[PDB]
DNA sequence: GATACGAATCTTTTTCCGTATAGCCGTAGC
DNA sequence: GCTACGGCTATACGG
DNA sequence: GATTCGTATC
């Protein structure tokens, strides 16, 4: 029944050896568990970095056949108020071991979305039952956590997945699904994911769906761009060239052609232009300020809706005005 | 728990960790009376 | 199969002599233990500087053998409401426990900053009637959270950040009692990443020794990360816009920090900044506020942070 | 072997640390409330914490209650910790007030209510308001005098979801007692002020002279004067001052002297934002301390309205129009930030910076006032009622609907000059 | 009877036009059973609800639809409590056993779909409870989040759900559908018509269908029997006539504040909309070759700012007057 | 009783001030079955509500102008409801911000081509519109909403997409003068000349309601007569705004700013909308001949910025005082 | 007799419906 | 027949 | 915190 699953859920690692990328964290937690003592962990980083697939694999490797009665998992999908923390967590972390297997792991996923009162009531539970219970905290935003809670928690930072790890996972997915992927399409997947395994898995699933024959046909870069409606680098470069060099009429015509022939959204083009403009000379310091401020204002306006033609004209005019400080 | 061969209720409970060492000692001392 | 206490719990101070930092306050606590006339105290300070440990050590050295039934350690984990203050605290304070001369029961109301207003109002009443037999020992990160009527009859002993020398002394004691190979640069890096937090330094040392063995700067920095309030200050104080943009994109974005965290840390650093004009400070605060609004609305992107940095540099360097 | 705020406690009325005018007015009010006539029934004492708001009532009752009592001495303070078996906690105060009304002749005893019930809970709060309201409007010919010492204190930040407001911000009398009680003709609200430095120094010197052997033994009797001056100048709380003095005297070392920090009042905070602080000449430090110590006051929209309504007090309003324009523009910008703490910081930093570059010596300042927004909202509600009545009578007579906007703009003005001007003719 | 928008709503996935990528992904996953969590987004009136309803009816059938599909939108409560209780309980429920007829004539996938339309109006507090809910109950339940602004969707939910973007229905996308509707409804139009309809209804087809229906009704009431002209659908939509626009431009050229204010007062008396006149001014000024680059940049930024202010819900008169004064003083 | 209600048309043919709009309404009423959701946008006083009533009478026969007032209750939001045969009235003014729940309940109760008229749709909050964008689309077989608003700018894009845009131009001077002549013919006032009606029309700025009310007020003041030099009875708040404009253009000081703030507080206590207060202050400031073109451009720029700020803000006093301070600084 | 000091004044106030249960009432049974 | 108990209920509190 | 008035005292 695992085939009738999304690729982001049936490719979830079950062992620590399948969690690519976070090599330092994996090695450190392996040393901790091999040496017995495991400090109170706190996993932080961008979403989709493997902060849950790592802790669940660690729990499975520690409590073999006992992942159920030794691990208590609470997330934002369930209530985690004062009453919950003071009753359920306390009762679970205050009782003796089932078979004297070790310590009782408590996984608190998405602990950032927790009230400060609960985060302060949890600290004494963490410190007073640390002999037989070790707490793990998963959070994407560190500012939501009490500084004392951060103090009484060893911090492991799950950085965005490097290119090598995502490439290895893509290779494994290709082998498991009997698929073919072009290297350019793989690089496009790398740049689209921007450090997120779930994005890569979803785009690969959509590409396999988009193929007439998922067996004898290879997922090309054009498929990877069409399945997500993302702008190709060529059209972004053409738009940037038209805005920077040609007059106002031809630049507007090119922008309309690019956004119409492929249906590309304006915000995606704005992000692409921002990325292509980062590795630019721009000797004058005012050009950078004008570009960043005007493009951020236009992106904020787009996030609230409006007239796409006016916003595109604003983009063109802003870029031209910012690059007039060049000469 | 036992009351067809009736109804059988089989329950299981975990034991608290008993953090205080003097708690067991004071319970033993109290039980001496 | 662990059965091994953490180094934070392993070498926890049991005496008022090995508690490093705040020499004058520790000496005052030692004098209190010697005499016994403990007044009501509200210990305040940053997390992880010995506030709770000092209270527990002084309770142990005052009550002594009567520590089992002489101290009532209440906390945020336990229920702390008006009902609990009116029954459990009332009965503990009202209890007639024989004690050595000049000894009083110590109600350890740790994390008192998280207590409800009605509970503190009932604490006022119970402390007004029971202070000749019991002496409450509050412990909070901010004294303002405890109501002023409660602070009226309670002496205040504010704790300060542990220095780089007391932390080094305690770390060396732990190293000697554990026989751990160390490096001078490693201990300096541990102190630097501690930011005055002794418990954090102990945890970092334990992680370093358990994951890499020898404790040097490289092994400390390959597991522990430099404080982001410092990279934020570095990028906010950068004279050139390109330098700040790089410091952001490589040390806060690719490192894996959310934009909202970058904005909040920037606001806090600007609040606690120095060598900057007041007009510049308020303009930077306004820009940070606009960026915070944009992040909250759902536009959280690197572009907004870059725009914030551009605005800050524009208001710093003028036109 | 005990705290110095006890033992060395006042024994007569003279020892009480209170100003002469405050003592005389409190005594006059008590003497008026003990007469057979009942012009005033309750005395609502109020003030900051530890401002001799409790130690004076007992001393007055020592020489007032026995004089007017019958023959055939102290107070009847309400204990909020007595959990009666067959009695709900709300009914505890009800029983207290219903059994304290029998102390008139041969049983006269003043009723002191310092520890209020859990007024943070809405139900018992309104039950208490009703109970004290019944006391004022009671048909009882004779009732004993009653005093409610509401110790005002700034309630800190809390995790309560909404639970309205007022009692979640401050513990003042207005947040417990309602407007009907405050404006009742039989209520006399005598507010108290922080203890002045002179009386604090006098009482600290009395404590020191009553125990000097240990002071000279610990080489502190010669350093006593500076300690007394610093303690009496840093805090206005007598009990806190005595506790700090005891802690310093009993100690043996070089521990710095510290005391509780007072919370800055609303008008005080407005003055600090507008004018500044004489203690600290650094704007950043002052603003940071103000936000850290009192953030529950600078977060309310009233404080921004307070600045808007009170920034015209600098130099009586003779400052440049550009400064006022900048101040109001930044206030509007902060209003346009949906209450972020950054907006709260900026809206005060800009005002303080603007009022610093134009600070001119020898310029008299005016007085401040609370923002005129409650009057405006009451007038708006009255206009709402008027418009509702006009639209109700309009639809009942003829089938014509009119939008409330048009009623406010066009119909409302012309309706009198049409209908009543033709009533003249009839 | 029924409005033309609801009468020609796509019933099956083969009728949704120009959304080729998402619709073909859904059609291909219809054969299989690995449909992932979906995040439909795009301009309003682009065919998200129609597409999800078509997929729902194709996968399960009318009888199984009620027992295997839950729909929640802005019309109902979608708070944190609702997400925590109703969505979680529905997802936990075992998928109902299809009948023999359902298995014979429908694919009947082993999962069920929770449709959360207009999810951009859901608070971030209630969007955090869906994270694990759409992850642990993934093999028995599927989630379809529909919104107009992805920015309102939190990053975790956007990462968990697949990103399907619905393209804007321009005059080269929904023209075939509009012509089909006109032919089925017996509508007589001139050459070039329905192109102005798609252009005025930019990034939307429902507005275009409504305009076509209104023009058809007007033509039927007239009784002439002649085809519908472009100016008719232009005036019916609310587009400012070109003569009024050129008069506005001429008043702008003569930089007299009093004359501009008087003519703006007259224009607001006419009752036109600020958004339409701003869009038409943009189209006139940007396209005109007579102007230079600097003027075009400044006017583009001014129009952007004016549209941003108008979208906030401000007075049209003041914004239009300020914009025209700025253009005059340029 | 009132002349506005006395001479209110009760049918499509009775309407004789738009012509083209009346013909379009006839076209819409020719087939009452396929009635799309209607959104009337135009200047206030045009007669959009009267046009909606006439259209409903055309669809639902006579008796539409009936008035079955009743009181409802929502959770205690006890908003009054004006019911009529196949016609219900909803005013977003009576419930600000909290309008979403009450409009949802009313819509679901009406659903049970019933028409519900929601006037001044601009006052609807972004949440009520968010509910309505699905309420209209879902139950579009048993209810047809018709909404009239002054300007559709604060209306979300989906609602404008699902509804039909119909423009209602304000009455012209000649036709409104003709309407005034018909009024004075039905109830004789013995006008000295017809020029006074034209001047009243010019002083109404296309608001027929304002023209009728001021004509009735002047007739009552002149004892059922009219005079060539009869004073124009403008609303009091407009006079107060003109006085405030004079104060601003005369006293450029901070005490004058305090006086202006007091005047603004009085205006707000008169329940006058803040946006229209800012608009009238701006336009009265632009009418002063002493100020030069640059000053007027600065005035209009500040007006735009501060009305945007007021739209994106809670407290209205701040923005008005800021605009006054900015214009005062510009003047000197 | 001059001056530091201190008090009055500068202020406005809004909700959970449900529920496990201690005592009360009808009642199965010895 | 009265009891001791199961179900009902008015309700102070809960979050 | 700033203003005005008011005693009280060295
Ligand atoms: N290192 C990895 N190697 C392979 N697949 C990975 C890796 N990290 C994540 N994934 C995949 O991404 C999915 C989601 O990751 P999770 O660990 O469940 O969530 P997360 O990474 O913690 O992000 P958040 O903050 O919880 S939304 C997993 O189920 C895997 O399929
Ligand atoms: N001065 C110190 N000397 C030695 N160990 C210390 C010192 N301060 C803190 N620690 C260590 O910190 C750990 C626990 O410190 P705590 O006193 O619980 O922290 P805290 O100061 O109470 O701050 P919070 O508010 O409770 S997080 C133990 O491992 C102690 O050994
Ligand atoms: N000279 C003195 N004057 C006043 N209080 C004194 C003095 N000497 C000792 N005290 C003690 O200081 C305390 C002050 O009590 P009060 O201020 O009257 O009570 P209070 O004002 O109600 O304080 P709150 O509001 O409950 S914090 C009492 O415990 C007194 O016994
Ligand atoms: N691709 C399409 N093909 C055919 N008709 C379409 C298409 N997209 C939209 N429509 C028409 O649009 C109407 C229904 O659109 P909806 O899907 O309800 O709107 P939407 O895409 O959900 O945008 P909203 O309502 O603002 S969330 C019907 O009249 C459809 O015929
Ligand atoms: N064609 C017309 N002829 C005469 N009077 C009219 C006509 N149309 C509207 N009115 C007048 O307009 C008044 C109602 O205006 P109203 O509908 O409130 O305008 P708006 O919809 O702009 O608020 C009625 O009193 C009526 O006398
Ligand atoms: Mg996870
Ligand atoms: Mg602690
Ligand atoms: Mg007292
Ligand atoms: Mg939809």
GROMACS .gro file of N, CA, C and O in nm, chain F residues 49-94:
model
  184
 1484UNK      N    1  -3.046   5.356  -0.498
 1484UNK     CA    2  -3.142   5.281  -0.417
 1484UNK      C    3  -3.281   5.285  -0.480
 1484UNK      O    4  -3.352   5.183  -0.484
 1485UNK      N    5  -3.322   5.402  -0.529
 1485UNK     CA    6  -3.450   5.414  -0.597
 1485UNK      C    7  -3.452   5.329  -0.723
 1485UNK      O    8  -3.554   5.266  -0.756
 1486UNK      N    9  -3.340   5.325  -0.796
 1486UNK     CA   10  -3.332   5.241  -0.914
 1486UNK      C   11  -3.343   5.093  -0.879
 1486UNK      O   12  -3.409   5.017  -0.950
 1487UNK      N   13  -3.278   5.051  -0.770
 1487UNK     CA   14  -3.291   4.912  -0.725
 1487UNK      C   15  -3.435   4.880  -0.688
 1487UNK      O   16  -3.486   4.773  -0.722
 1488UNK      N   17  -3.502   4.971  -0.618
 1488UNK     CA   18  -3.641   4.950  -0.582
 1488UNK      C   19  -3.729   4.938  -0.706
 1488UNK      O   20  -3.817   4.851  -0.713
 1489UNK      N   21  -3.707   5.026  -0.804
 1489UNK     CA   22  -3.786   5.023  -0.927
 1489UNK      C   23  -3.763   4.894  -1.004
 1489UNK      O   24  -3.856   4.834  -1.059
 1490UNK      N   25  -3.637   4.849  -1.010
 1490UNK     CA   26  -3.607   4.723  -1.078
 1490UNK      C   27  -3.673   4.605  -1.007
 1490UNK      O   28  -3.728   4.516  -1.072
 1491UNK      N   29  -3.669   4.604  -0.874
 1491UNK     CA   30  -3.735   4.497  -0.800
 1491UNK      C   31  -3.886   4.498  -0.823
 1491UNK      O   32  -3.948   4.392  -0.835
 1492UNK      N   33  -3.946   4.618  -0.830
 1492UNK     CA   34  -4.088   4.626  -0.862
 1492UNK      C   35  -4.115   4.573  -1.002
 1492UNK      O   36  -4.216   4.505  -1.026
 1493UNK      N   37  -4.026   4.603  -1.097
 1493UNK     CA   38  -4.042   4.551  -1.233
 1493UNK      C   39  -4.038   4.398  -1.234
 1493UNK      O   40  -4.117   4.333  -1.302
 1494UNK      N   41  -3.945   4.340  -1.158
 1494UNK     CA   42  -3.935   4.194  -1.152
 1494UNK      C   43  -4.050   4.135  -1.072
 1494UNK      O   44  -4.116   4.040  -1.116
 1495UNK      N   45  -4.078   4.191  -0.954
 1495UNK     CA   46  -4.169   4.128  -0.858
 1495UNK      C   47  -4.306   4.196  -0.852
 1495UNK      O   48  -4.381   4.177  -0.757
 1496UNK      N   49  -4.340   4.276  -0.954
 1496UNK     CA   50  -4.468   4.342  -0.958
 1496UNK      C   51  -4.480   4.450  -0.852
 1496UNK      O   52  -4.381   4.494  -0.792
 1497UNK      N   53  -4.604   4.494  -0.825
 1497UNK     CA   54  -4.625   4.596  -0.722
 1497UNK      C   55  -4.598   4.544  -0.581
 1497UNK      O   56  -4.584   4.423  -0.560
 1498UNK      N   57  -4.592   4.635  -0.484
 1498UNK     CA   58  -4.571   4.597  -0.346
 1498UNK      C   59  -4.427   4.581  -0.305
 1498UNK      O   60  -4.401   4.541  -0.191
 1499UNK      N   61  -4.331   4.611  -0.393
 1499UNK     CA   62  -4.190   4.604  -0.356
 1499UNK      C   63  -4.155   4.714  -0.257
 1499UNK      O   64  -4.077   4.693  -0.164
 1500UNK      N   65  -4.215   4.832  -0.273
 1500UNK     CA   66  -4.185   4.946  -0.187
 1500UNK      C   67  -4.248   4.931  -0.049
 1500UNK      O   68  -4.249   5.026   0.030
 1501UNK      N   69  -4.300   4.812  -0.018
 1501UNK     CA   70  -4.358   4.784   0.112
 1501UNK      C   71  -4.249   4.785   0.219
 1501UNK      O   72  -4.131   4.764   0.188
 1502UNK      N   73  -4.286   4.808   0.344
 1502UNK     CA   74  -4.189   4.821   0.451
 1502UNK      C   75  -4.225   4.733   0.570
 1502UNK      O   76  -4.300   4.775   0.659
 1503UNK      N   77  -4.173   4.611   0.572
 1503UNK     CA   78  -4.199   4.516   0.682
 1503UNK      C   79  -4.078   4.514   0.775
 1503UNK      O   80  -3.993   4.425   0.772
 1504UNK      N   81  -4.070   4.618   0.859
 1504UNK     CA   82  -3.960   4.629   0.953
 1504UNK      C   83  -3.974   4.525   1.064
 1504UNK      O   84  -4.082   4.503   1.119
 1505UNK      N   85  -3.862   4.460   1.096
 1505UNK     CA   86  -3.857   4.362   1.203
 1505UNK      C   87  -3.719   4.367   1.267
 1505UNK      O   88  -3.627   4.431   1.217
 1506UNK      N   89  -3.705   4.297   1.380
 1506UNK     CA   90  -3.582   4.296   1.458
 1506UNK      C   91  -3.531   4.153   1.467
 1506UNK      O   92  -3.607   4.062   1.503
 1507UNK      N   93  -3.404   4.133   1.434
 1507UNK     CA   94  -3.338   4.004   1.442
 1507UNK      C   95  -3.235   4.007   1.555
 1507UNK      O   96  -3.220   4.108   1.626
 1508UNK      N   97  -3.163   3.897   1.572
 1508UNK     CA   98  -3.062   3.886   1.676
 1508UNK      C   99  -2.953   3.791   1.631
 1508UNK      O  100  -2.982   3.686   1.572
 1509UNK      N  101  -2.828   3.827   1.659
 1509UNK     CA  102  -2.713   3.745   1.624
 1509UNK      C  103  -2.617   3.741   1.742
 1509UNK      O  104  -2.614   3.832   1.826
 1510UNK      N  105  -2.537   3.635   1.748
 1510UNK     CA  106  -2.439   3.619   1.854
 1510UNK      C  107  -2.299   3.610   1.795
 1510UNK      O  108  -2.267   3.516   1.723
 1511UNK      N  109  -2.436   4.000   2.183
 1511UNK     CA  110  -2.571   3.996   2.129
 1511UNK      C  111  -2.591   4.104   2.024
 1511UNK      O  112  -2.628   4.217   2.055
 1512UNK      N  113  -2.565   4.069   1.898
 1512UNK     CA  114  -2.578   4.162   1.786
 1512UNK      C  115  -2.721   4.156   1.734
 1512UNK      O  116  -2.758   4.075   1.649
 1513UNK      N  117  -2.804   4.246   1.788
 1513UNK     CA  118  -2.946   4.252   1.752
 1513UNK      C  119  -2.970   4.360   1.646
 1513UNK      O  120  -3.028   4.465   1.670
 1514UNK      N  121  -2.923   4.330   1.525
 1514UNK     CA  122  -2.937   4.424   1.414
 1514UNK      C  123  -3.079   4.425   1.361
 1514UNK      O  124  -3.140   4.319   1.341
 1515UNK      N  125  -3.133   4.544   1.338
 1515UNK     CA  126  -3.264   4.558   1.278
 1515UNK      C  127  -3.259   4.525   1.129
 1515UNK      O  128  -3.160   4.550   1.060
 1516UNK      N  129  -3.369   4.467   1.079
 1516UNK     CA  130  -3.379   4.424   0.941
 1516UNK      C  131  -3.505   4.485   0.879
 1516UNK      O  132  -3.613   4.484   0.939
 1517UNK      N  133  -3.489   4.537   0.758
 1517UNK     CA  134  -3.600   4.594   0.683
 1517UNK      C  135  -3.643   4.494   0.576
 1517UNK      O  136  -3.578   4.479   0.472
 1518UNK      N  137  -3.753   4.423   0.602
 1518UNK     CA  138  -3.800   4.321   0.510
 1518UNK      C  139  -3.905   4.377   0.415
 1518UNK      O  140  -3.971   4.478   0.444
 1519UNK      N  141  -3.919   4.312   0.300
 1519UNK     CA  142  -4.016   4.350   0.198
 1519UNK      C  143  -4.042   4.229   0.111
 1519UNK      O  144  -3.961   4.135   0.110
 1520UNK      N  145  -4.154   4.225   0.038
 1520UNK     CA  146  -4.179   4.112  -0.053
 1520UNK      C  147  -4.067   4.094  -0.155
 1520UNK      O  148  -4.047   4.180  -0.242
 1521UNK      N  149  -3.995   3.982  -0.145
 1521UNK     CA  150  -3.881   3.953  -0.231
 1521UNK      C  151  -3.779   4.066  -0.228
 1521UNK      O  152  -3.719   4.103  -0.330
 1522UNK      N  153  -3.758   4.122  -0.109
 1522UNK     CA  154  -3.664   4.231  -0.090
 1522UNK      C  155  -3.623   4.244   0.056
 1522UNK      O  156  -3.708   4.264   0.144
 1523UNK      N  157  -3.493   4.232   0.084
 1523UNK     CA  158  -3.440   4.244   0.219
 1523UNK      C  159  -3.327   4.346   0.220
 1523UNK      O  160  -3.249   4.355   0.125
 1524UNK      N  161  -3.319   4.423   0.329
 1524UNK     CA  162  -3.221   4.530   0.343
 1524UNK      C  163  -3.115   4.489   0.444
 1524UNK      O  164  -3.148   4.445   0.555
 1525UNK      N  165  -2.988   4.503   0.406
 1525UNK     CA  166  -2.875   4.481   0.495
 1525UNK      C  167  -2.786   4.605   0.489
 1525UNK      O  168  -2.737   4.642   0.382
 1526UNK      N  169  -2.762   4.669   0.604
 1526UNK     CA  170  -2.670   4.786   0.605
 1526UNK      C  171  -2.542   4.751   0.683
 1526UNK      O  172  -2.550   4.731   0.805
 1527UNK      N  173  -2.424   4.745   0.617
 1527UNK     CA  174  -2.298   4.717   0.686
 1527UNK      C  175  -2.263   4.823   0.792
 1527UNK      O  176  -2.180   4.796   0.875
 1528UNK      N  177  -2.327   4.940   0.785
 1528UNK     CA  178  -2.302   5.048   0.884
 1528UNK      C  179  -2.341   5.001   1.024
 1528UNK      O  180  -2.266   5.033   1.119
 1529UNK      N  181  -2.453   4.929   1.038
 1529UNK     CA  182  -2.500   4.893   1.174
 1529UNK      C  183  -2.407   4.788   1.237
 1529UNK      O  184  -2.405   4.779   1.361
   0.00000   0.00000   0.00000
